[PDB]
Write a protein that binds this ligand. Structure first.
Ligand code: VO4
Length: 149
């Protein structure tokens, strides 16, 4: 297994950005990637995933900002579809683990119905530092309200 990934359930993991040297490595373990990094900060083309048969969702979230609730719902629904196909999914951003950690917490809320408090604790247990900003926490609160309703 690619030990940089941490799984929040049987099928969904989050990690730092794999480098071009690691692409075959994570393609062996994952069939789908959620790429949160902005186009201009990529060090290889995302066609690298396509030539390996890996499905790509490119939904960039700028450095130190939170996704909108709509953006997050779109990401979650796509992850859901891939998991239902039997695929393992890797969420990643470049640099810290604020943005990828936010999507990982949202996935636990969305798929397992965990309240935000427990989902946050879980992901932070996996990677201390996940969910870095007040804005990221606030969109997770907005998600929780959406789901409860
Ligand atoms: O720029 V971050 O993914 O550490 O919020």
């Amino acid at each position: 297994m690619w030990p940089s990934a941490r799984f929040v359930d049987d099928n969904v993991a989050f990690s730092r950005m794999p480098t071009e040297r690691e692409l075959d490595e994570v393609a062996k373990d994952f069939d789908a990637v959620v790429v949160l990094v902005e186009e201009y900060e990529l060090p290889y083309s995302l066609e690298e995933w396509k030539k390996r048969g890996v499905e790509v969702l490119h939904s960039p979230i700028p450095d130190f900002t939170a996704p909108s609730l709509e953006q997050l719902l779109e990401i979650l629904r796509w992850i859901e579809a891939r998991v239902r196909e039997g695929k393992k999914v890797l969420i990643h951003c470049m640099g810290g683990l604020g943005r990828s950690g936010t999507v990982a917490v949202a996935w636990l809320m969305y798929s397992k119905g965990l309240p935000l408090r427990e989902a946050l604790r879980r992901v932070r247990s996996l990677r201390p530092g996940a969910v870095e900003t007040y804005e990221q926490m606030e969109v997770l609160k907005e998600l929780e309200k959406f789901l409860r309703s």
